Amino acid sequence: MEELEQGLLMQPWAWLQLAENSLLAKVFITKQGYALLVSDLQQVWHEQVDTSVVSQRAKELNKRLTAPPAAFLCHLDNLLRPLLKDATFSCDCVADALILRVRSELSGLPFYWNFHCMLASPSLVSQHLIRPLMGMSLALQCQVRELATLLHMKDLEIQDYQESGATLIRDRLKTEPFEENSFLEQFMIEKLPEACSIGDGKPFVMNLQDLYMAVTTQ
Amino acid sequence: MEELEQGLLMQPWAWLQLAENSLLAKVFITKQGYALLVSDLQQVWHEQVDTSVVSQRAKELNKRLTAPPAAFLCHLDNLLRPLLKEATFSCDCVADALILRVRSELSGLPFYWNFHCMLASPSLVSQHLIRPLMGMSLALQCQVRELATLLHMKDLEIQDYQESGATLIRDRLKTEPFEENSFLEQFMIEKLDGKPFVMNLQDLYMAVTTQ
Amino acid sequence: ESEISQEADDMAMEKGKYVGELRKALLSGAGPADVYTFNFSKESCYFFFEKNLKDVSFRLGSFNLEKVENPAEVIRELICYCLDTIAENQAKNEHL
Amino acid sequence: LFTNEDNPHGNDSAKASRARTKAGDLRDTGIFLDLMHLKKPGGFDISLFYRDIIS
């Protein structure tokens, strides 16, 4: 309560090591456990179960729990590296039920364990999974616009330097001042097909993640 | 599969002028049923069902008044015409028994209407819409990098402007050598509800939502 | 007051506009551009009136009929009152 | 000296430099000058440039 979202949104946007898919999934190491949180505004598949219900489902519904939850907590706590040092997470995308079989393997014999994507908690998701839109707007879509304005005053300084002497001579630096409208129009008409850069999320791990943490800090 | 949602996504979002909340609703009612996509940012009404609910609403209150479905769809199309330049819905501050109240004085006798609402699904906010938002964020990052490179090359050209320049300088605007630490510090420390989101991104959202 | 709220709910309009429409339609005055189709269906023996616009059918009102037993007296009083008000208007006109 | 100009030095900076030099000269001589807001009294909006060496 008021600690899982605060202690979970801080997870850097790091790609989970799936064999095939390139989904955006983040989870942060929390002493109270873990809860895989995904945000895309259309349909949630988030693992979050009450302690009591999983308790009964382990006592008189699941007979495979041959390892105490203390072992799982210890494994969760003693995992400082986010990226694999070289436990590959394989998925079989053959049907609607995406059963991401998380093979719990520490060293040697792979322990048999599997996940299940049940319904998430209504209150927490409905209250804290709409914030990222406003958090992005208020911070990033103001900082970027202020950077653009700083460029605009730099262009103004260049142009009134030019009008007050220091006339440009060589053609190599002979460039027109930047215009946002003309740049947008030329992007739409000429370089939009060639600027489509998605791939596997190259900036997702080098620029998007850190700036998003800066966005999601507040 | 894709036709209806592809056509509806091109339709611009219609913010309802209620001055009490943020409403991000899509309306496009021309053919193939009615697309009354009412969403309060927490529960979208996937009201794409057939004439069953329309007929039950029109008949359970009107035992002597009937209108054809063609008239219903024409009225639905004409519903929000004088609003995109009233059809206002008012919520309340009461518990989970959400009963909307319409107390407009039109004939002296209050008019009674019920707003059917189902349970809000907590599995409705993590699949698609941020992926185009991530594309727009990538476009914004590319624009920021382009503007930063333009700033850098203009700074280099300004470095040419002191040996062939020496123009009128107020002496309070000297250009120090560019330092990444100072740039990041000034970008971070100093220049760091829902209504500002919509009234700041309604115009920008249509730019990249297509391609 | 049986069927009036639909004409304020369907096209979501408030009072005053309907009052103004009634005042400028029931009284004298008509528009040459806007044709009026006052279809009184005597052949079908069913009394109803319709106002057609933008090739769609809507509702305006309903008027059940109950036969009056003294039409001659009311019509004679009506024409007498019309003549009296003509005389009064002419007298005021000449005085003015 | 009273005027509505908080900084009348949008002209050539040579004039400003010469004025500063002469102000230093008269300060050395013992002359003191006074200026205060006239255009917008209050707000510390005056003496944008004169706040350097004039007090």
Question: Using CB atoms, which residue from B62, B78, B106 is nearest to C8?
Answer: B106
Q: Are D1 and D34 in contact (CB under 8 A)?
A: yes
Alpha carbon dihedral B79, B81, B84, B85, in 10-degree steps, equals -140
Within 13 A of B179's CA, how many CA atoms are on the CB side?
7
User: Apex CA B5: angle with CA B3 and CA B8, to 5°?
Assistant: 105
Please tell me what DSSP assigns to residue A22. Answer: -
- The phi, psi pair for C52, rounded to 5°, reads -90, 135
**Distance (Å) from the C-alpha of residue B45 to the closest C-alpha of chain C?**
21
Residue from A56, A60, A37 nearest A48 by CA: A37
Rounded alpha-carbon distances, angstroms, from residue C69 to A165, A203, C63, C66: 103, 90, 18, 10
Q: Beta-carbon neighbour count of residue D27 at 10 Å?
A: 13
Residue B139 exposure: Cα atoms within 13 Å on the Cβ side: 22
Instruction: Write out the H or E segment, with its range, that includes residue B170.
Output: none
Of A44, A198, A207, the CB nearest to B126: A44
DSSP A30-81: BTTB---B---SS--------HHHHHHHHHTT-----S-HHHHHHHHHT---
Please state, in angstroms and as integers, the Cα–Cα distance from residue D21 to each residue in D9, D14, D15, D47, D49, following that order.
15, 10, 10, 18, 14
- Separation between Cα atoms, residue D8 and residue D16, nearest integer Å: 9
Which tokens sit at B22? 């943020």
Nearest CA in chain D to B166: D13
Two structure tokens written together for B145: 């990098």
User: What φ, ψ does residue C46 adopt, rounded to 5°?
Assistant: -140, 115
Q: Which residues of D touch B170 (CB under 8 A)?
A: 13
B-proximal residues of A, 159-218, CB under 8 Å: 161, 164-166, 168-169, 173, 178, 184, 192, 195-198, 203, 207-208, 211, 214, 218
* Closest to B136 (Cα-Cα) out of B39, B201, B44: B201
Residue in C2, C9, C22, C60 to test binding to B, most B beta-carbons within 10 Å: C9
Nearest-5° Cα angle at A47, A45 to A50: 135
DSSP H or E stretch at residue C21: helix C17-26
Look up residue B57 and give its two tokens.
């609403």
Distance from CA of B121 to the nearest CA of A (A): 8
Q: How far is CA B180 from the centre of its chain?
A: 36
Question: Which residues make beta-bridge pairs with B38?
Answer: B45
Q: Which positions in chain A touch B188 (Cβ < 8 Å)?
A: 214
Name residues whose C-beta falls within 8 Å of residue B57's C-beta, 6 or more positions apart in sequence.
B116
Residue type, A104: S
**Is C9 close to B109, i.e. CB distance below 8 A?**
no
Judge contact between B29 and B203, C-beta under 8 A: no
| Residues 7 through 46 of chain D touching chain B, CB cutoff 8 Å | 12-13
Do A165 and B160 count as a contact with CB atoms less than 8 A apart?
no
User: Which residues, at least 6 apart from C23, have a Cβ–Cβ distance to it below 8 Å?
Assistant: none
B interface mutation test: which of D7, D11, D12, D13 has the most B CBs within 10 A? D13
Contact in structure between B144 and A147 (CB atoms under 8 Å)? yes
* AA letter at B185: E
Hey, are the CB atoms on B109 and C1 less than 8 Å from each other?
A: yes
User: Rg for chain B (alpha carbons), in Å?
Assistant: 26
Query: In chain D, count of helices (H) and strands (E)?
Result: 1, 0
Taking a C-beta distance cutoff of 8 angstroms, is the pair A200, B203 a contact? no
Cβ distance A20 to A93 under 8 Å? yes
By what method was this entry solved? Answer: cryo-EM
* In contact, A43 and B128? CB cutoff 8 Å: yes
End-to-end C-alpha distance for chain B, whole angstroms? 19
